[PDB]
Enzyme design. Structure first.
Site, short mmCIF file in Angstrom:
data_model
loop_
_atom_site.label_atom_id
_atom_site.label_comp_id
_atom_site.label_asym_id
_atom_site.label_seq_id
_atom_site.Cartn_x
_atom_site.Cartn_y
_atom_site.Cartn_z
N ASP A 91 0.83 -1.19 0.00
CA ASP A 91 0.00 0.00 0.00
C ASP A 91 0.87 1.26 0.00
O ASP A 91 1.37 1.66 1.05
CB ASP A 91 -0.90 -0.01 1.24
CG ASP A 91 -1.84 1.18 1.31
OD1 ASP A 91 -1.96 1.88 0.29
OD2 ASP A 91 -2.44 1.40 2.39
N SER A 116 -0.58 15.68 -11.95
CA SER A 116 -0.83 15.34 -13.33
C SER A 116 -1.06 16.60 -14.16
O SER A 116 -1.59 17.59 -13.68
CB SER A 116 -2.04 14.40 -13.42
OG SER A 116 -2.44 14.18 -14.76
#
Ligand SMILES: CSc1[nH]nc(N)c1S(=O)(=O)C(C)C
Length: 330
Positions: A35, A199
């Site tokens: 994770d 992004s």
């Protein structure tokens, strides 16, 4: 040193991925959920409330000659999906794919929430976010990666998740045969303890690319792609009959649909998520309403590039003094 381990979807939907991990002496092998959005290595154990164990493999520290109680240490964690676990702590030898760390903090669960109990395939979590998020008290502990880092050939790990197929976690090297083209690297903020990056925008299907900054986290422990409501609405508007359902808890679409791809930007580069990756199947067995793999992050407070996004790429988690993230097509 290096390590290399195969990671395998737990079910037909890629809800999560499990990777075998050797703990203790002699080795006890547990299948852990790696994770990158948390920083605790915790396991089902001989100490876990019996009624809360349902088919998991447990770690028994009393059978490990290298286990030592970390006296006074406790841990307690709550995840973004509302699940939780807590317990005490041992140090022991932990190996992943041939890479061994001695004195790793292994957090033994005394209590786990129902979602963990109900998932027989996940024996615990191995956190790969920054150690500043580790919950052990009163002495915070380091992640497996942070402990391994100085011994690694290069201070990196990579995630290469499969679509409905196995993939690979590598530690200490970049497998140049595992991706196509070049790797594009992008800046990371560690301010919130995550692999947080920005992004450069998105496209839906064959549509034009929209340049826009989207700050989010690379999180292998989250199944879906969670993005701003504007972006998500633009995606689902291209699927006939798709709608957001408050009763179901997100966007659903007719199972008869063909889903468009979704592209996200990494610098000037582009990662394309095929439409099929966004299909999470019937909302309930036999239903003709299907659950979407791109959902709104509104209310979560953060955008999450979960498995839906990450499995479309070869992803480099660069733990150099100034960390960065790399993405390649594959
Ligand atoms: C990834 S969660 C999910 N995927 N496919 C479903 N049917 C589900 S669910 O949890 O039953 C609900 C959100 C529809």
């Amino acid at each position: 040193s290096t390590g290399s381990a195969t990671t395998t979807p737990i079910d037909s939907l890629d809800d999560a991925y499990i990777t075998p991990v050797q703990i203790g002496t002699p080795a006890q092998t547990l299948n852990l959920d790696f994770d990158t959005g948390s920083s605790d290595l915790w396991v089902f154990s001989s100490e876990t409330t019996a009624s809360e164990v349902d088919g998991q493999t447990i770690y028994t520290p009393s059978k490990s000659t290298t286990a030592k109680l970390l006296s006074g240490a406790t841990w307690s964690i709550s995840y973004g999906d509302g699940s939780s676990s807590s317990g005490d702590v041992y140090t022991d030898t932990v190996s992943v794919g041939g890479l061994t760390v001695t004195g790793q903090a292994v957090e033994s669960a005394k209590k786990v929430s129902s979602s963990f109990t109900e998932d027989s395939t996940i024996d615990g979590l191995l956190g790969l976010a920054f150690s500043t998020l580790n919950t052990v008290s009163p002495t915070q502990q380091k992640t497996f990666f942070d402990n391994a880092k100085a011994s690694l050939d290069s201070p990196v790990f990579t995630a290469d998740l499969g679509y409905h197929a196995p993939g690979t976690y590598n530690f200490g090297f970049i497998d140049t045969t595992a991706y196509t083209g070049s790797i594009t690297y992008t800046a990371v903020s560690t301010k919130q303890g995550f692999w947080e990056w920005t992004s450069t925008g998105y496209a839906v299907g064959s549509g034009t690319f929209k340049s826009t900054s989207i700050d989010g986290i690379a999180d292998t422990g989250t199944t879906l792609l969670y993005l701003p409501a504007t972006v998500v609405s633009a995606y689902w508007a291209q699927v006939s009959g798709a709608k957001s359902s408050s009763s179901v808890g997100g966007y659903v679409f007719p199972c008869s649909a063909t889903l468009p791809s979704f592209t996200f930007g990494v610098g000037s580069a582009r990662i394309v998520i095929p439409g099929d990756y966004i299909d999470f199947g019937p909302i309930s067995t036999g239903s003709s309403s299907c659950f979407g793999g791109i959902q709104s992050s509104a209310g979560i407070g953060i955008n999450i590039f979960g498995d839906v996004a990450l499995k479309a790429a070869f992803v480099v988690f660069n733990g150099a003094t100034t960390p960065t993230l790399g993405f390649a097509s594959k």
